[PDB]
Amino acid sequence: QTFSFPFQQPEKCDNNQYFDISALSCVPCGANQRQDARGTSCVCLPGFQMISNNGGPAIICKKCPENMKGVTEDGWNCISCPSDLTAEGKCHCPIGHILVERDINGTLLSQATCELCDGNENSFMVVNALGDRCVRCEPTFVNTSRSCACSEPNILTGGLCFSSTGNFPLRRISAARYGEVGMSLTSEWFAKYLQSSAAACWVYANLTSCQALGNMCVMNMNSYDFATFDACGLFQFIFENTAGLSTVHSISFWRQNLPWLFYGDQLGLAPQVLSSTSLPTNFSFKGENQNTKLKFVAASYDIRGNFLKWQTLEGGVLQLCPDTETRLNAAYSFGTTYQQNCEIPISKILIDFPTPIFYDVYLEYTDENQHQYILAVPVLNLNLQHNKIFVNQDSNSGKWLLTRRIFLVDAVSGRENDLGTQPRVIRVATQISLSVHLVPNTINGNIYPPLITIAYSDIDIKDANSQSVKVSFSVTYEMDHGEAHVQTDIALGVLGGLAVLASLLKTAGWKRRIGSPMIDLQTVVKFLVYYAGDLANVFFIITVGTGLYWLIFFKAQKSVSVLLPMPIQEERFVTYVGCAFALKALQFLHKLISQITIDVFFIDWERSIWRTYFVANEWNEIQTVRKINSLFQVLTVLFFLEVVGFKNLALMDSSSSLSRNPPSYIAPYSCILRYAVSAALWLAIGIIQVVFFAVFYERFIEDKIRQFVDLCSMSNISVFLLSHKCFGYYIHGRGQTFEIAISNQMRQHYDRIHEEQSIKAYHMMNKFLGSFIDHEMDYFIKDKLLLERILGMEFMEPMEKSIFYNDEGYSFSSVLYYGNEATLLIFDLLFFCVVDLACQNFILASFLTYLQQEIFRYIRNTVGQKNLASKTLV
Amino acid sequence: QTFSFPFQQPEKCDNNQYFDISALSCVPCGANQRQDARGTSCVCLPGFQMISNNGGPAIICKKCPENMKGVTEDGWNCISCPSDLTAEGKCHCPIGHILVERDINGTLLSQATCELCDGNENSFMVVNALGDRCVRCEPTFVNTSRSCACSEPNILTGGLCFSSTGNFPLRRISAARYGEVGMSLTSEWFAKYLQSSAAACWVYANLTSCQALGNMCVMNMNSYDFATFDACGLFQFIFENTAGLSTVHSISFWRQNLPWLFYGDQLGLAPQVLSSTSLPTNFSFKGENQNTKLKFVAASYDIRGNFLKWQTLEGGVLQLCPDTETRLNAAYSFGTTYQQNCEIPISKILIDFPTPIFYDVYLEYTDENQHQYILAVPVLNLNLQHNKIFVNQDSNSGKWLLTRRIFLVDAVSGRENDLGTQPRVIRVATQISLSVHLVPNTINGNIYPPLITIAYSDIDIKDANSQSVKVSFSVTYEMDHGEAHVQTDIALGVLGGLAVLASLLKTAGWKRRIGSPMIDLQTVVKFLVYYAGDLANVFFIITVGTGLYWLIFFKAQKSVSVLLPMPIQEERFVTYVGCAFALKALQFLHKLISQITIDVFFIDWERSIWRTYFVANEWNEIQTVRKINSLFQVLTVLFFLEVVGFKNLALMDSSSSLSRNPPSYIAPYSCILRYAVSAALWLAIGIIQVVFFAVFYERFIEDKIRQFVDLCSMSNISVFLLSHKCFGYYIHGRGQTFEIAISNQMRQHYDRIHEEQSIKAYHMMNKFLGSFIDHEMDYFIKDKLLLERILGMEFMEPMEKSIFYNDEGYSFSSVLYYGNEATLLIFDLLFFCVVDLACQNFILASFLTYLQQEIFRYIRNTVGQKNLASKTLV
């Protein structure tokens, strides 16, 4: 069959119907019965006394005789009444009396007399809100008054009765709660329980009221106007007037009875508090030291000041975002920079935080003589009016007031005229932050006291079924960069000074390789280009060294002495690196432009057109072999980082693990280690490729360069190059490769040929270079020295001979994109580490370094060969 | 200064010391005072009457005169005693009396007489556990007995007093709770509250006890032994004996008072319940239908059967893993296949689940006439003994018992001898699953009733500070694959039948291209190879079509009619696809082997050695240009999938969005859509590359093939190929390219030359092919037809002429890795979609399709050119 029946709710059963628990449908009560208070059964009508009622819904009651109209408090019986009946027919009598119907024995009386409670003699008694038995009246009443009357000469506020003659806060209190920006609302909680709690804290020593006034100075945002008179003004008044009983432990800010709320009513105690050592613990990371976790505790008081309990902050206290127990607990381990972010809806907050609970966070350590101690943690409130000016949101850490107490959700102090209706404003703590800061020069883990910088939002409530709240939480670690900046400045400076000597030598070499000894204007521009090139390397070295220093001394250290930089330091380092990319790009573009506009020429018979199109095409295919298999390199670098797990060395955590198991917490990435692993895998695989590639292909797979040298020998062609204006390359005449330097007289001759025009002129020069090399120019051969070969220069200037230099190391390889693969290897690394830096994605970083290779690989092969068509035949 | 003081706990203050709330240190009580019950103040010693005590800790009490040794219940006064003193000095008297010290007024009496409560007459009264006032005795006592004595002739169990004569479960109950595998322990809860609840449910109608016995049949695992007599045997006994008052709504399994626990005491009601329509709702996904969420409700009863409330399952009920409001609320969302997994520790469970709460899940819909209804959900318990055999963990859905009630944590029924000490076994529900199954043939969203398959673990507790529990939760959707399997079988079958005609034509062509008309054994192997090749394509087409059909008809549909397959269907599809990869790999290897072992020859002068090394090297560089820029393609395919967001089309969810914002829930991937986007981007970018690449390079960047045809014209070389044994390629003699078919007589001549050996023989054949083409062989030219050009065959057999075929479409391109890039394009796609299928990672999928290209690219260029050295000079 089918199993379905109408949906019925207990709230919708009729007044004469009751809700069944095993049938889930409304059921009529029966005979003169009516629905009970809650609706799961029926209790019958006034005037009817109940006979029998077991644990079932069906009950039997009968109209008892009319001469006894009323019933007892319990509906088992009915008896006569001394006065008129009630609406429920329960035989009341006037305000101040107790309704006696039973006896001492419990037997009935059938008359129901009601007698006055004494309350005015050696034994004090007042009715107990149910009208049954006398109960004792409040001890305050019986003290200040004489027997719980509290007439006009005394004062009755908040439920107590203080004598008029004694001390009493006589002043027109202001029960105003400071709102978001320019609002305020006279909350009922203050206006009812503020004056009473002040006077009870002062006159008697009734501590829970002193705490209940500390909590009113905290729910209102610690705002000490110092000219008006509200919760915190009242707290400071009580503080000032209770100076006879001085201080509690040794803290001048802590009065004997009151709690500890402020750090002082003045605005200079921020550094002297935040910068005092006072913590003997020695935190570490892994080894023989077993202190990796911060031991927090927190004493939690109710609204009325009741001291619930002590408790460790572990397990998710004062972090109101939900997660498993591992992540929450791990947001407290020394080293793991926690960061959490969720989005609560209003209805859940109003259900799970009916009233505020106030905490005072403490940090627990051990003393010298093995006794245990606790330290105090100072909270920067960021919402703290002081003279209607927000002090705690500044930059100068001198104008800071440090409070002591925090809460999470405050759905009480926002209530309007009636204390039981509903808030119109609820106040949530939407940004908590705990910052740990270790003393400057250490060998151990000593730290300053931590700090909690809480900031409270004042969300409105107009739907209570929408307007989710955006709450967060953070724990961030720090240190004082003293040696880092100075040693980087020094190193950088001296490398820059060392780099000036390299650009001068290169510029003077480029000077001596052109027939013009005058530094008119081209020299200065050439020197600036060379200097950009030779300073990009210094910036690159500094950045890789610094990133790798951070990685090595942070991931593997026994007793903590360095902590990674935060955003500011990251930014400084980032600024230091964009410069390296810009300057290296400048050098690469200059080199490519210098390579494209070359002058080349083939001589037919040195040592027809269907032979030169053979060599010319082979040369046009050898101009972009990079000695490093590019694509493979990029893919390998993107592999290690993403699937074997090296990108997990970059987490801001304390463990240099690999492939963190996903019940763990995954700390945020640091953009100063992301540039260390990326730029240490790239160099580690670049070096591999040289040794592997080079050696392997030299032993056995093709070496295209050494083929082209021999290919000319099997087709008796000669290749003639001119690099700048007077420095060239080989001839294949004695084939051997070897550099040539051309005398100024010859370059004059070579340019006078540059005005049927192909064959007519092409053959004029083919009979000239064959007449130049086959012996009034008369070149001569020579050899470089061991000092010239590192200087990249020339000592002897050609002016009458046009000297030739023998070089067996394939010198002509520095123009065809092969012998200058250092720049390419590096320039393809800063591109990867800059796209990785703007958008932190790794696939996007290495799809944009492959895309920039092929564009520049294509530009070289198109404009390069288009040039060669003009400089030679067709 | 420093702010630190010793750490002190209230539990450690001495018996004469009290804990301060504002000083947080132990403080001595004072004069004859002692620590209070809780420790936040002091109440003074016995024999001392308290004078004054306000809300402070300091109190004053004095030793009152010795003639009145005892004090009242309240320590404000002291009075005489009628008997001896107590340990606390509160002047007790014997067991059955009330201690009267006040009066009706509340005045003192100074004698403290104590009087008997009546309890035995027309007004019944018994002391009230504080010894102060008479209060009424239990209604059961006053019913069955006559005035709450309950002597021997009646029975006093669990707190009630049932008459002996009436009905009563007279049988030796067994209070044994079934454990994990072979354990059991006599829990105290059953042995105290089982017989009493049974007898109260039967004799009176006291409903909360009937529920309290349903809960005992549920905490014990519904195990109906049917020969012993324990909680569920007792429930079935009460069910059988209460047949006078029949059934509640219409359900024959639901007795009038008892709850609904079972679906029947027999083992065939599983299909008839799980397969009845009974749900008029029409679920959809996006459009004008506004039913996307399943409307669950659940009535929750306490242990004692109290009916807490109705509530929707949203917000995280019966899923005890912590998460943000959004994931928990998104669990019930028609389409999103939820899957959750966390790991609770014991201490948290024992803190947050002090006692069980029992739910009964219902699904709510709307009737025809706008009234609202609820359906019933059946839970498969999987731990349900039936005759000491586990029925619900089978495969046959006929031997299934379907229960009704579930709970989450049961830390009560495991307790040993004393009910208040501590559990030794706690029972957690560690695997919940909700499975939704839509009726076979629909146009709307009608479904079967859902099902909850809960399975309870019985974790032990030996540390309570370790042994975390591994709990989960799942919601999975399903449908009946009726047309899918038959239509795939049919389609596949007819494509296979169509594919037999292609392998026969190819085999007959390969037959006619060799001079051997006999099918000895090579024909059958060749045909099998061709058939593997031509059937891999059919499998590939079926798989892509099916995956893309699922994607199109599931992501974009208005009123739901298809749901994605689960693991079983996934597996079937996976089995269907590994075949395509294996067969395509076989075809690719065969093609590569056939291409390597080719016969090639260059003729010097047709239309010296420094001219042929020019053409030979150009040909050796044109053999691996693929018409599709491989690397780029792979990278582009790995880009779209990971950074622009196409891998989010593969989520098993209901939205075809892109880049899902991460406050959302991220549903699991389906390995049957992951093969649809991957193999629809690859084809979409492969087609782009052809049109783009081809056209662009034809208009303007090099076309290497058309260069080699002309390069021969500028060096008067001729290229001579032999594909199989008698079918070859061009000559460059009239340069034009055109296929050649060699007569059997000539191939006999060409092989007799194959026995100074280079030049001696090399020139013998160079003077022969020049003597063959320059006119007793006498080739002749002809032309193919429009029918031959699609058949890839020949109609006319060469036996006396060795015919030549003119073909202007560069026919010689089918051996050098260019004109057969279809296989390469596809074979590189199934490699990507198979490595993606074993390990679901995407970077690893496309680092292993780039790595397999270069290995096969290298094998071709090494063994290919090593072959050419033997077949030609040097």
Curated annotation (Swiss-Prot), chains A, B:
InterPro entries registered for this protein in UniProt: Growth_fac_rcpt_cys_sf, Meckelin
Result after altering residue 322 to L: In COACH1 and JBTS6; found in a patient with Joubert syndrome that also carries mutation 1329-R--S-1332 Del in KIF7
Cytoplasmic side: 513-522, 714-811
Result for mutant: residue 601 to L: In COACH1; uncertain significance
Location in the cell: Cell membrane; Endoplasmic reticulum membrane; Cell projection, Cilium; Cytoplasm, Cytoskeleton, Cilium basal body
A GO molecular-function descriptor: filamin binding
Protein name: Meckelin
Annotated organism of origin: Homo sapiens
